[PDB]
């Protein structure tokens, strides 16, 4: 049976996703290559659709510590529950996790995240010669995103250790297992001496806003919320961002559009989400009972996976699915999931998103310094990111 992932660590997808898209079955039996756990997977826009919106299908189930899973360690502290957002919903903080995440957050701090990738390409423009668009942009604009929006103000040093535990937990390889696991229980340890003072001053970041909720959340649960943000804000915006600029960096004739057109940057914004892949392994959910999708039975305890990068480039869902076309006119894209897990960090997401292909659509000319097969990529991330982005105008 074939194993997963498909070890494409680059922007190239694997081509399996293609491959199980147009067989003759609308779910796959794959086995994780890190547990053994069988698994299902899922590569079609229309069966993504159904699963992802069938409550019956899991997300909790499928995060619980035992649950049949892809990744070859379990994604928390020992001993703790690292049980996701769902830790949160359930204190009853819906309406804090709104406005620290939501349109108003955006309203708060859409200001200082324009003001800041302009300051950085400025700086960036000024420079004889060559410079990485990953540690010279991307490092501090994500960074500052996570300090002002999520946690508190982070030295380097300590954003450093928060990094380095993301990318050392967040993998399928490249790293022993017990390596791993120490990456979350450091991460948590963080948090139980560091997450309060965070929490304490400052600003309106989310770390703040929840700490201060009335039901108040203890310690190790505050430590809880400050690893999920790490986890999910910073691996993912940090690749995310790398991805998109070598996407834009690959078409000037769209950045020459977004110039003469910066009306068009939002539709670039979402077209990037579609086209730019992100995770190399997949959304998942458990059967809650025995339930089945286009045909194929699956078992209650059972975990079906579903490639969201597979989804966003299904010819029957996109036309010509592997052309970056700003404006395209087709259905929504999965980016950002789909269904009642749709990530809330989304409109912040977006934000960023938007300030940093502005910032390029102003300034044509970048170009990358070296050609795309010559850049390196960290590898076995769940969240691919290339190690530099040689540029230059
Ligand atoms: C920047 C690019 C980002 C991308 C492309 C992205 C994408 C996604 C996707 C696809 C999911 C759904 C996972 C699933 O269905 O199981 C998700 C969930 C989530 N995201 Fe984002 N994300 C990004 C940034 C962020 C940020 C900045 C935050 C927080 C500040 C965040 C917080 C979360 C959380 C907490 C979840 C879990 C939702 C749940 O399980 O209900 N994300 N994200
Ligand atoms: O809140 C959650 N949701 C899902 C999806 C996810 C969203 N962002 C992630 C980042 C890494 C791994 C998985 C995800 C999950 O697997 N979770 C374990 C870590 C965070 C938790
Ligand atoms: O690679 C992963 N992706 C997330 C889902 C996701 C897919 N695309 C995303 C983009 C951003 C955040 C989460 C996701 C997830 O659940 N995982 C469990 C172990 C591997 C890890
Ligand atoms: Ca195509
Ligand atoms: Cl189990
Ligand atoms: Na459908
Ligand atoms: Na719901």
Redesign the pocket.
Do not use: N
């Given at each position: 049976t074939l194993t997963y992932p498909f070890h494409d660590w680059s922007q190239e997808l694997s081509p399996r996703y293609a491959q199980l898209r147009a067989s003759d079955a609308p779910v796959c039996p794959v086995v994780s290559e890190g547990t053994g756990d069988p698994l299902w997977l899922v590569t079609r826009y229309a069966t993504a659709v159904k699963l992802l919106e069938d409550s019956r299908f899991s997300?909790e189930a499928?995060?619980a510590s035992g649950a049949p899973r892809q990744?070859p360690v379990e994604?928390?502290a020992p001993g703790t529950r690292?049980?996701?957002?769902?830790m949160l919903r359930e204190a009853g903080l819906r309406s804090v996790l709104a406005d620290g995440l939501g349109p108003r957050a955006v309203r708060r701090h859409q200001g200082w995240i324009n003001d800041l990738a302009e300051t950085l390409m400025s700086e960036l423009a000024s420079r004889e010669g060559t410079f990485d668009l990953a540690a010279d942009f991307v490092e501090p604009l994500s960074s500052a995103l996570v300090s002002r929006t999520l946690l508190g103000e982070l030295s380097a040093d300590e954003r450093d250790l928060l990094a380095h535990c993301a990318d050392t937990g967040?993998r399928f390889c490249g790293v022993t297992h017990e390596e791993q696991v120490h990456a979350f229980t450091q991460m948590h340890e963080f948090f139980l001496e560091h997450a309060r003072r965070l929490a304490g001053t400052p600003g309106e970041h989310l770390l703040k806003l929840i700490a201060e909720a009335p039901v108040p959340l203890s310690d190790e649960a505050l430590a809880e919320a400050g690893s999920?943000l790490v986890?999910?804000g910073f691996?993912?915006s940090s690749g995310f961002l790398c991805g998109a600029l070598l996407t834009l960096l690959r078409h000037p004739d769209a950045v020459q559009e977004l110039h003469a057109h910066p009306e068009r940057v939002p539709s670039a914004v979402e077209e990037l989400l579609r086209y730019t892949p992100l995770?190399t392994?997949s959304?998942?959910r458990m059967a809650t009972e025995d339930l089945e999708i286009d045909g194929v039975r699956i078992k209650a305890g059972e975990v079906v996976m579903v490639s969201l990068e597979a989804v966003n480039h299904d010819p029957d869902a996109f036309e010509d699915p592997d052309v970056f076309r700003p404006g395209r006119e087709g259905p929504m894209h999965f980016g950002f999931?789909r269904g009642r897990?749709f990530?809330p960090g989304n409109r912040l997401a977006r934000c960023v998103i938007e300030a940093t292909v502005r910032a390029v659509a102003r300034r044509p000319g970048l170009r990358l310094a070296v050609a795309p097969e010559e850049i390196s990529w960290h590898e076995g991330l769940?969240?691919r990111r290339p190690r530099a982005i040689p540029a230059t105008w």
């Open positions: 997300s499928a995060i990744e994604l928390r690292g049980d996701g957002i769902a967040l999920l986890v999910a691996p993912t995770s392994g959304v998942k999931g897990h990530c769940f969240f």
